[PDB]
Design a protein around this motif. Structure first.
Motif: not given
Length: 217
Positions: A70-73, A87-92, A97-101
């Motif tokens: 979240r902070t990075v985005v 792209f994020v190196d992880g799952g759901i 977290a990225a979508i929400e940010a």
């Protein structure tokens, strides 16, 4: 490079309107008692654009990967335009977290993840389970492998000096002043292993100790 046909298949899998010409990819790695380091790679036209690679640091003793994403985005995209695909190196959890940010800062970009242990593309709260040979799977793996290489390079120089120090801690009767001289001069095991007895002796003022250095190397 990322293959054109596989990029097109990716675009189709994700129902993207636009070709994924610029893709940015995030690895989240944590240094316990220190900080989380996010490493951000960039692909344009299927190849790394290394001038555009960045890191973000989040100071915290304990990891909190979703908050870190979240902070990075927010930090990155409050200053930079979004890419065609993130792209994020992880799952759901990471993808969400990225979508929400992104939603928080009023921005739209597709986000795709690769589940760490599963042959699973993650997109919009769902795991897409592809066959192992699937070209889109191979493509995301290539991206993940680059975010990983970049993440590993963090503090490479620090680590090399540490690795060299560990090996020098094994030479009997060297002492701390001469050890530091060798580290500051050579930097790495690669460099000291390329050196003559005479160079090593000159760094520390002793041929006798330099022979023991060579022995231990």
């Amino acid at each position: 490079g990322l293959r054109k046909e596989a990029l097109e298949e990716l675009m189709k899998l994700l129902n993207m309107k636009d070709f994924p010409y610029r893709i940015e990819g995030i690895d989240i790695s944590h240094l316990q008692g220190k900080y989380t380091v996010a490493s951000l790679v960039v692909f344009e036209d299927g190849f790394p654009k290394k001038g555009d690679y960045r890191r973000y640091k989040i100071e915290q003793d304990h990891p909190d990967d979703y908050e870190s994403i979240r902070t990075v985005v927010k930090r990155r995209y409050s200053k930079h335009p979004l890419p065609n695909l993130l792209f994020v190196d992880g799952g759901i959890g990471q993808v969400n977290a990225a979508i929400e940010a992104l939603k928080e800062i009023g921005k739209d970009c597709p986000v795709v993840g690769l589940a760490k242990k599963e042959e699973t593309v993650v997109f919009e709260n769902r795991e897409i389970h592809l066959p192992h040979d699937h070209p889109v799977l191979r493509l995301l793996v290539q991206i993940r492998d680059e975010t990983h290489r970049f993440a590993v390079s963090y503090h490479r120089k620090r680590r090399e000096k540490e690795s060299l120090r560990s090996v020098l801690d094994n030479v009997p009767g060297i002492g701390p002043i001469r050890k530091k001289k060798l580290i500051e001069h050579f930097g790495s095991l690669e460099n000291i292993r390329s050196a003559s007895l005479e160079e090593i002796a000159r760094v520390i003022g002793s041929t006798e100790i330099a022979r023991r250095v060579l022995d231990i190397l």
